[PDB]
RNA sequence: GUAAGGUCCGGUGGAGCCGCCGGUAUCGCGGAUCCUGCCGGGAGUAGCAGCGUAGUCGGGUGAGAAUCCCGACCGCCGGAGGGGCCAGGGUUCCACGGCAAUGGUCGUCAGCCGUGGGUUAGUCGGUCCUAACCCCGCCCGUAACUCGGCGCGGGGGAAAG
RNA sequence: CUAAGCCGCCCGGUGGAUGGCUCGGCUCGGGGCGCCGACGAAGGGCGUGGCAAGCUGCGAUAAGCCCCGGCGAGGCGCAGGCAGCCGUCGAACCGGGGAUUCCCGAAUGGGACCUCCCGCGGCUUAUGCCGCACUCCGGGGUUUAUCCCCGGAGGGGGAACGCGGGGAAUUGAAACAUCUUAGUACCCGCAGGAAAAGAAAGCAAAAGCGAUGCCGUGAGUAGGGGCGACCGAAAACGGCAGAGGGCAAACUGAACCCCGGGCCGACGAGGUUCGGGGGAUGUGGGGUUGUAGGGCCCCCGUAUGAGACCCUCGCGGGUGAAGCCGAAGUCCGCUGGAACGCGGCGCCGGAGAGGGUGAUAGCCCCGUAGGCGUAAGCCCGCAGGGUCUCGGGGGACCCUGAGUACCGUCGGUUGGAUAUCCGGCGGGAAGCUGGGAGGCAUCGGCUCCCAACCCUAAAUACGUCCCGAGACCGAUAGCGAACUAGUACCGUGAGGGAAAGCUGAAAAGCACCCCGGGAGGGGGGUGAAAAGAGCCUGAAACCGGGCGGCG
């Protein structure tokens, strides 16, 4: 997920996306120990960095709105 | 001991996690130059700093 | 684009620990006579698509496309320059880019064209 | 160096020499000139005096002698220089040599004057030396060639800088080591009219 | 603690699997700085279920584990299948 | 070559090296009960007894069994070698798979090596109170202090009270 | 055809010397750069990678997140693997600017036998937020309890250098007490990128100089010293750099300063208005010095002119991150696994410094000689808008620093010797019709100066760091550390502290076959060479076998 599309969406659905991504991160972390048939080992890293991106642009939007 | 404080327990847990062998994939990636680390420990022989 | 020191220790340290944007420039190779006349340039960094002729080594005089470029080891792979393992599989021979010559350019990149125009 | 290790001496009463040793196992010997990892008995010191003084008049006399020896046929050839085709020693050239700015032009002028062979031999003699100087940045042991002395610098330094073994100087900065590299006098030299005039004004 | 920042990962061990089917109980590895109230709120809000009891402990490896008992009206097996534990 | 030592031939090695002139130096090894590393005779020797002298017979697993497992017989402790549990230790706990090294012998066994697991509290302890005692603030002394100290105010101090 | 045993050579094992290499050390003239912290530092604990133990980096956004520029096709640290994903919508990487930034720690709302716990007020619907430490400064309210509120300070850290105090002994004197070691080691306190000093109550005597500091020299001199051992300066002269200013007082007397609002001005300089806190126990103006200076009074003469400084709503220029350009052979024949080698033929050169590339390369590549570009920032100029400064002669009146200068005595310190400096105790002036110094004291002459209040750039010291260099060492050397080193490990603690570099050009890192429980062995392959990972070379001591001599 890229910042150009992140900036299109508002803060509310940014929060919703963060929630969903955290759910998925927990589920994938569980599956990691459950089974070894992991097609994509990098999913956890990609999800973590996507969540970090969402939080960063969320705070940027907050600063813009406050200013 | 039966009764422990949380901070000491956490430090002991960190040491326990530290005490393990080098990964075999690390050995093959490094071409057998890295075969051990200085934190290996035997409970009855080498005692924790705490 | 600056190495002032004449001390071998410092020169070798710079070579070993050069950042990636410098390792990128350290992969230059000379162009053939035809390409040199056409583009008014003496050399360029090698790209995968470029067709390359080997001037030194066991495969001297062999022409082939570049398949892989590794900046960390300062090496490249050219199709046809291969060794045979004991089992029987073919593996590529790493060749320094300074030992080969460029005879065709994968010049679809606007930034590579910018390099050519800047250096002309 | 070597004086950082804390040590104690056991003393007598044990079957080994009275030496200073560490306080923790394996209790190696330390801080002793004849002990591994210890201090050096008499190491090099920065305070040592290396500068050597030379009287001004004595140095002037040495410079005179070197300049005179420059025009000695026997010494020049005995120093190894190729002066077979040189027209005359000392070789005085017109002042126009000072304005040469291109190395190709300098090469052609030197070929005409007959000192190109000396540059060729200097290049041939230059090579890789033996020892740790290669580790320290002294891989090559280059040779010396013709020395150009000019009254003024109008571009000759830039036009003749690159030739192997060639040094170009102004007569005001001339030196004994310029005239006699490696303590052996009789270097092949090319003087100009202005340089000779200034040398006459100086008488030394 | 934010309801979506307490759970780190489900537990998929033999003991956890047996408990899921026998005692209507889920097992999570959660943030060590999470209290029982936080764990209860997180589980209820995330999974739209009602939780009866929470028992927490700290493993010898420094992590925090939580056994959460669901009310009889809700089946832990359904949530386990939802999460893919099976 | 009186010599310190130089040079040459045969072999290994795979990238540097020397003659001469002039300078410079952490410049020359047999000893210091010298320092560091490596290896010898002692030696296939002592030790593997003394304070509790314990094993034998059938069967099993296994490439391999005095040493591991099951049954019987014979023995030791039995106011402790049995049961519960602080301090200390910190994974030594459990299962499976193993024997290059560790185990005073062997070992298929293990507090050993590999893999995966395991500690659930309103009631049990800490958390509350204070005892001997200790700490901070004001105050006095000190050239000064992280130093010594009476008085006043606040706080801590027991996992067997 | 000698059992044991001894010597010599060859082969093999053990071992890790020697030789070669070097991304590491060490030392340097010059150059650059020098602080961080309550807006929470240094240091530490714990976490963080798909496989992840050490180191490194990061912090629940956790080998990373965002934006503006360079670079131009690869990238995912030390670290050669599996599997995946990231990148042309420009990554990785580099310079600049932001975001997140757990706990302890000056640690600070209150506690620490465990870097973890327990509270009080306001906002918040609730998820959750902002305050609450001590010692002070400038204010307010009131509960007059320092009770509450507002604004602002200090604490801790830093390799060496700096400033102010406290202050030994071994040792030397061939013993030892004055002395020396020594104002040293160490301790306490206080700052900065430098600190301290600094503008004459000074030095000097035919003449004079004209703030301070550092360098050469004066000089082992004057001088101190059981006049023993030993200790020990300054002035002058030659250089680096050069810079001088402000109070107290006389006199005037609220004409004044700070904080928070408003306007004119341009958002700035400057000008102005209101509220609050200071201020007659004196804000502001004035004034700062010696054969005297200033005030005040009198007289003469000016400004109509000449400076100096402040600001940028604006414009031009210089410098300034990553960075960009930068000549010439990869020509023929041999040796070779591989040409950087040998022979032949050419070329550039303001470029023949150095390095890499399968051998030793000016022309293969990177670089070099020489040039170019650069956001923010900094500096100069133009234009415009403001503030402030600017002369001499007389006096008869006024001011010019107090437990201070200085004397006696005691301890310390000093070369300071009856003649250094600091401090304690008792005593203690003149103060402009005045006072101090000139190496014992006093009297007279002469010369120099004006304390008892404050500030001051450059020349100077150091290097936790960086650029550059080396008749320095070359893995028992060089820093203790060339590497997961201040690491492992030792001691309750203060503290102590190692060993350990190298396959090959390329893993091409030995496919398949026989045997063995396995480790491995023998064939057969790879490679120029096993150099076979127990990997460059492979010595000595030691051990096994073969051979020659003795037995």
UniProtKB/Swiss-Prot annotation, chain A:
GO cellular component: ribonucleoprotein complex; ribosome
Pfam families in the cross-refs: Ribosomal_L29 (PF00831)
Gene: rpl29
Organism superkingdom: Archaea
Family: Belongs to the universal ribosomal protein uL29 family.
Gene3D superfamilies per record: 1.10.287.310
InterPro entries: Ribosomal_uL29, Ribosomal_uL29_CS, Ribosomal_uL29_sf
Assembly notes: Part of the 50S ribosomal subunit.
Region forming the signal peptide: none
Disulfide bonding pattern of the chain: none
Keywords, in A-Z order: Ribonucleoprotein, Ribosomal protein
GO biological process: translation
Coiled coil: none
HAMAP family referenced in this protein's UniProt entry, alphabetically: Ribosomal_uL29
Molecular functions (GO terms): structural constituent of ribosome
Record protein name field: Large ribosomal subunit protein uL29
Curated annotation (Swiss-Prot), chain B:
Record key words, sorted: Ribonucleoprotein, Ribosomal protein
Superkingdom per UniProt: Archaea
Stored HAMAP family: Ribosomal_eL39 (MF_00629)
Gene3D superfamilies given in the database record: Ribosomal protein L39e (1.10.1620.10)
NCBIfam families tied to this protein: PRK01242.1 (NF002316)
GO BP terms: translation
Cellular component terms per the entry's GO annotation: ribonucleoprotein complex; ribosome
Protein's UniProt name: Large ribosomal subunit protein eL39
Stated family: Belongs to the eukaryotic ribosomal protein eL39 family.
InterPro entries named among the record's database cross-references: Ribosomal_eL39 (IPR000077), Ribosomal_eL39_CS (IPR020083), Ribosomal_eL39_dom_sf (IPR023626)
Organism: Pyrococcus furiosus (strain ATCC 43587 / DSM 3638 / JCM 8422 / Vc1)
Source organism phylogeny: Archaea, Methanobacteriati, Methanobacteriota, Thermococci, Thermococcales
Subunit structure of this chain's protein: Part of the 50S ribosomal subunit.
Curated annotation (Swiss-Prot), chain C:
Listed CDD domains: KOW_RPL26 (cd06089)
UniProtKB keywords: Ribonucleoprotein, Ribosomal protein, RNA-binding, rRNA-binding
Pfam families: KOW, Ribosomal_L26
Database matches in InterPro entries: KOW, Rib_uL2_dom2, Ribosomal_uL24_CS, Ribosomal_uL24_euk/arc, Ribosomal_uL24_KOW, Translation_prot_SH3-like_sf
GO cellular component, one term: large ribosomal subunit
Top-level taxon in the UniProt lineage: Archaea
GO BP annotations, alphabetical order: translation
Gene Ontology molecular function, alphabetical: rRNA binding; structural constituent of ribosome
PANTHER family named among the record's database cross-references: 60S RIBOSOMAL PROTEIN L26 FAMILY MEMBER
Protein family per UniProt: Belongs to the universal ribosomal protein uL24 family.
Function, in words: One of two assembly initiator proteins, it binds directly to the 5'-end of the 23S rRNA, where it nucleates assembly of the 50S subunit. Located at the polypeptide exit tunnel on the outside of the subunit.
NCBIfam families hit by this protein: rplX_A_E (TIGR01080)
Assembly behavior: Part of the 50S ribosomal subunit.
Protein name: Large ribosomal subunit protein uL24
Curated annotation (Swiss-Prot), chain E:
Keywords: Ribonucleoprotein, Ribosomal protein, RNA-binding, rRNA-binding
Entry-linked InterPro entries: Nucleotide-bd_a/b_plait_sf, Ribosomal_uL23, Ribosomal_uL23-like, Ribosomal_uL23/eL15/eS24_sf, Ribosomal_uL23_CS
Coiled-coil segments on the chain, per record: none
An annotated Gene Ontology molecular function: structural constituent of ribosome
One Pfam family it belongs to: Ribosomal_L23
GO CC term, one of those recorded: ribosome
Signal peptide, first to last residue: none
Function: Binds to 23S rRNA. One of the proteins that surrounds the polypeptide exit tunnel on the outside of the ribosome.
HAMAP family reported for this sequence: Ribosomal_uL23_A, Ribosomal_uL23_B
Subunit organization: Part of the 50S ribosomal subunit. Contacts protein L29.
Assigned protein family: Belongs to the universal ribosomal protein uL23 family.
Protein name according to UniProt: Large ribosomal subunit protein uL23
Protein's organism: Pyrococcus furiosus (strain ATCC 43587 / DSM 3638 / JCM 8422 / Vc1)
